[PDB]
Amino acid sequence: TNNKRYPYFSATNSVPATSMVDYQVALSCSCMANSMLAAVARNFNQYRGSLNFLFVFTGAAMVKGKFLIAYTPPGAGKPTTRDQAMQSTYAIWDLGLNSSFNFTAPFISPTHYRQTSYTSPTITSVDGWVTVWQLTPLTYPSGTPTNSDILTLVSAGDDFTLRMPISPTKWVPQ
Amino acid sequence: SYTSPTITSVDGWVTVWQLTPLTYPSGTPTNSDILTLVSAGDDFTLRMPISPTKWVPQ
Amino acid sequence: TNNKRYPYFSATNSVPATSMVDYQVALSCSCMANSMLAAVARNFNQYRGSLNFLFVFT
Amino acid sequence: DQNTEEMENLSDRVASDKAGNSATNTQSTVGRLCGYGKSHHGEHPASCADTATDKVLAAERYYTIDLASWTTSQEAFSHIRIPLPHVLAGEDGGVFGATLRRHYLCKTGWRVQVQCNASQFHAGSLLVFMAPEFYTGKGTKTGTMEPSDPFTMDTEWRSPQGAPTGYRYDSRTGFFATNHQNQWQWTVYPHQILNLRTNTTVDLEVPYVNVAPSSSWTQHANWTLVVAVLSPLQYATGSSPDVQITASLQPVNPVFNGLRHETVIAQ
Amino acid sequence: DQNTEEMENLSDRVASDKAGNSATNTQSTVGRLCGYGKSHHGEHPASCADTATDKVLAAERYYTIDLASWTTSQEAFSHIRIPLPHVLAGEDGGVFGATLRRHYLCKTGWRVQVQCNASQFHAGSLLVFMAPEFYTGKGTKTGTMEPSDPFTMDTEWRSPQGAPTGYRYDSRTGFFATNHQNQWQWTVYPHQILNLRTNTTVDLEVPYVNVAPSSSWTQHANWTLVVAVLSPLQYATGSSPDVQITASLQPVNPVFNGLRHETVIAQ
Lengths: 174, 58, 58, 267, 267
Known about the structure:
This is part of a larger assembly, with three copies of chain A and two copies of chain D (267 residues).
Chain A: E1 21-23, H1 36-39, E2 44-48, E3 52-57, E4 64-71, H2 82-85, E5 89-94, E6 100-103, E7 114-115, E8 130-139, E9 150-155, E10 161-165
Chain D: E1 15-19, E2 22-26, E3 33-34, E4 63-70, E5 81-84, H1 94-100, E6 103-106, E7 109-115, E8 125-131, E9 191-194, E10 201-206, E11 215-216, E12 223-231, E13 243-252, E14 257-259
Parallel strand pairs in D: 3-10
Antiparallel strand pairs in D: 1-2, 4-13, 5-12, 6-11, 6-14, 7-10, 7-13, 8-9, 8-12
Subcellular location (chain A): Virion; Host cytoplasm
Protein name (chain A): Capsid protein VP3
PDB class: virus
């Protein structure tokens, strides 16, 4: 609120919500655009393969948290509770020594390929939402912070394929 | 053990005390509990079945 | 004090006493009874071998 | 003993288990008890002539949910029970539950993971153990004899009573009952400890054992899971009291047979 | 041509198909069209990285239900359509339907059997044929443009209209529309006849063909089944008018993949 997006999923002490975040997997999103993959994926008409989302924790070493993570395919709606989420491809992330987690949302697609995104509406092809919430709160002793930010970074796996060059959408930023 | 008194056969006392206190920095508890659990080794042998002492607990 | 035995030997910051505890080894004690070994050891007249006490810090 | 390590949670203490399209991680494990010594072979019930519904991926995954909140307040041997199958039973139990009540009989074994992460300035110890025939209930029944709600998932914790005489039941007294338990031997069950100190996690897998190779899930619950605490949660004025305990489970190689048309009741 | 035989219905005309824990019989068959020439290999969708839920017995059986009543009243090429998957879709569709809407995608082929038994003093001929992209609907929509109820199972029969121009749709006229059909060529589709005279039964099996190896069952219905009549039911004053038409179907080797959390809507 200021519309000052910034890079961190950020969390604490307890209960979400419907959590932490939620960004869909529509390789044209608000998120992924500006990103290389998403920036490159665009000067191309189609995409196939598996995507990968990497999450690096930035909190105090004397801290401890535990996150549930999931890709939920289109069919029903956007989950509205972890419980509702879990029945999807996910991974419980245990915050320890090992700073970052590697996730990767497949390609659960009818079509062998999908459109890199041009949102003359949302048509049937595009697909994905990835959500994340804590499965246990993010804990911490005395002398350490409540609050902590964890840093976001998209990528295209060992399966990612972009084909049909094109040239998008004339911009002129800000 | 059937303690129509303490007869000569039975034997043992096990004790335990700190040889240095139990230390702790700032932000942590004074006090701490440590959990007890008996067992019969690689040497334990029970023989002569019988049937004790009729109880009916509490 | 309430005679609410509970499971922990419990300790701190400093000096015992004559410490921490003391339970004898009379496989009929107050302690060991209720325990499996002690519970099993009973439906038997005699015992031999070495006993083992395990202590886990909490 | 186990690899080199810590303030932070390391190496031969980082484990992962993938099952179906649900994959787990822990960076502070101490093992995984394969309770008894054998797992569960999708050995078809010999009981039925039903060449049942086998090896379904979709149900053979990790369902995760919250059991309760652990807090400074609670007393030793206070306990929380989770009967299986009857908690993965429907809605919250995926395709397993569905196919579960469309079928008369099941035979499965469970692979469980209970999680409770804290901080190195926290003391306490949580005992986690799976026991088949055990007790649930959540009650002394209404007005007519016998005994309140085994299927319910203990909404809150129950009080260690200065004495089994395993919550007998019709106004009475003098003497004990066949639902005894000596929470004082309650470490003969495949178990595993959860020591905020040592442990952030605890993994348990248990084979199939009822009275019949397959049982019926509408009147029995062959195993109840118990997340009850053996050395409470002291916290020093600063620090995260709210100790959220979560459990995530997986039916291992269930074998269903004896199919029919969506069971009907739960109050 | 086919074995020796009749007033009564005999030998190389008695067939049986067992599938799952549902087993069929007919004592007056004429074949079973394996439409196109190939069936469906549980060939996993190459489309997904989803090592899906395969070879489930429980769903790979014969679901049976009633389509409609055939009677002296009806005119030629009047028709009745049965879209698959969307009719085996839930409740009435066993464990198939359940696992069906807990999953994003399916890929299956259908093995169908429509039955209509009469008596040798009855005349008529019922045309049964499976066509993928076809038409349903059951309507001209409400108040805003486009087009009433494909998922519904034509409750009653629709009127052969003296002309395709395949029930176009927003108040108009002049000319035809892409939902045409020439019920006059409506015998290029794998079909089979049902001649009260010859036939009491008709068995059809059809492989997988959409636009994608797997499709999504919430917006498409790759195949619609059509039990519409080509020479009406005359009956001579005595005789059983009530010609009850029943259909029983079986998904053959469905392959589901892309799992999630019980789809929600049907009015």
